[PDB]
């Protein structure tokens, strides 16, 4: 049982959710969003038969929830966006029927950015130093959020610190550090992997000494 | 639209202690309340439904209680893994999440591990010069970085970023970036970040 969502992206002032593993026609559906603040918010509700739809006041009129039971998919159409910038989840209630049930399955989430700025890929710079060693790489001048940083495709997982992006308008900068035993670097190869989906850019940068 | 008042928005507690969050609804919600835990990078995780019904797999240290308008959620024998954000959700009639409650766990003071990094060659040939300082695995979160170029304090061009509390360490990490042009970078030799008796790390453009 999974919910797979489809973007999503950047817009200056329609999402889909594909369901499998359960009987979609028997459950209601909802959209939830997570603000850049740590705040969770219910955004739309649809019933089993798509005849019921409800929205909160902070979004009513601009959003329209819909479903296609034939293809086990849910949709959300968003218009006149503003501080609607958030990550959007499709959530499924824990039980069948048109009664309201707490959510028990969540999609991975797709981000929606509403800004009067334009997509910029990051410039990715390696941080090599001039017991254990700390390395880093700097992800500079991109827009919008988010970016994914990993080390050795994800295999270095302990001792990794990825710092929250800071907007020195109108661009984000982020940095990431990894700590490894002495000699495993530079003997082995350490590469930071960065992905910026809103610009379809992906860099791998090896950390070279000196 | 039913309104949920979660409180407090943020909590600090000792290891092994107990903590308690309350949600207050704008009408009777008839025990149709749930509690979720959210960890950065993970989808929301359900802890309690129908006020006090624990989920399978949820430790008995989590508990809920309440009726009508007043509800409470508690975590006892606090563990480092319990560092997250917690939300209530009424589903009596439609849905309303509470405001959220970030939880931090106290611990013994820790000095940061500091490292300084010169600008990379790629950035230099493109006209820029960012010097990066990491202050890793320290406690508590209040710390200060001072940048010195050739022995003199430099204040313009610094951007700072803290991580959230570590779920296994209870420490914090912080990153400080000094950005100069490549032009002003090449006119000086010694670069220093001091973390506040301070901890100093430097390099010289040889």
Author numbering:
A (entry chain H): 2 to 14, 19 to 87, 89 to 136, 143 to 222
B (entry chain L): 1 to 196, 202 to 211
Task: Please quote the paper that reports this structure.
N-methyl-D-aspartate receptors (NMDARs) belong to the family of ionotropic glutamate receptors (iGluRs) that are involved in the majority of fast excitatory neurotransmission. NMDARs form heterotetrameric ion channels composed of the obligatory GluN1 subunits and GluN2 (A-D) and/or GluN3 (A-B) subunits. All of the subunits contain an amino-terminal domain (ATD), a ligand-binding domain (LBD), a transmembrane domain (TMD), and a carboxyl-terminal domain (CTD), which interact with each other in defined manners to mediate functions including channel gating, allosteric modulation, and cellular signaling. More recently, a number of studies on intact tetrameric NMDARs showed that the subunits are arranged as a dimer of GluN1-GluN2 heterodimers and that domains and subunits move in discrete patterns to control channel gating and allosteric modulation.
Toward this end, we screened for IgGs that showed signal in an enzyme-linked immunosorbent assay (ELISA) using the intact rat GluN1a-GluN2B NMDAR proteins in the presence of 0.01% LMNG and no signal in Western blotting executed in a denaturing condition. We identified four antibodies that satisfied the above criteria and found one of them, IgG2, that inhibits the activity of the GluN1-1b (hence GluN1b)-GluN2B NMDARs as measured by two-electrode voltage clamp (TEVC) on cRNA injected Xenopus laevis oocytes. Importantly, little or no effect was observed when IgG2 was applied to the oocytes expressing the GluN1b-GluN2A, GluN1b-GluN2C, and GluN1b-GluN2D NMDARs, indicating that this inhibitory effect is specific to the GluN1b-GluN2B NMDARs. The resolution of the 3D reconstructions ranged from 3.9 to 6.6 Å as estimated by Fourier shell correlation (FSC) curves, thus, the quality of the cryo-EM density maps was mostly sufficient to identify and trace secondary structural elements as well as the side chains of bulky residues. Furthermore, we solved an x-ray crystallographic structure of Fab2 at 2.5 Å to facilitate model building into the cryo-EM density. The cryo-EM structures unambiguously showed that Fab2 binds to the R1 lobe of the GluN2B ATD. The GluN2B residues involved in IgG2 binding are not conserved in the other GluN2 subtypes (A, C, and D), consistent with the subtype-specific inhibitory effect shown in the electrophysiological experiments. The cryo-EM structure of GluN1b-GluN2B NMDAR in complex with Fab2 provides some insights into how one may improve the inhibitory potency and efficacy by re-engineering IgG2, Fab2, or Fv2. For example, Arg101 in the H3 CDR loop could be mutated to a glutamate residue to promote a polar interaction with Arg67 of GluN2B. Furthermore, the L3 loop is in proximity to GluN2B, and the sequence could be altered. Last, the mini-loop between L1 and L2 may be extended and shuffled to promote binding with GluN2B.
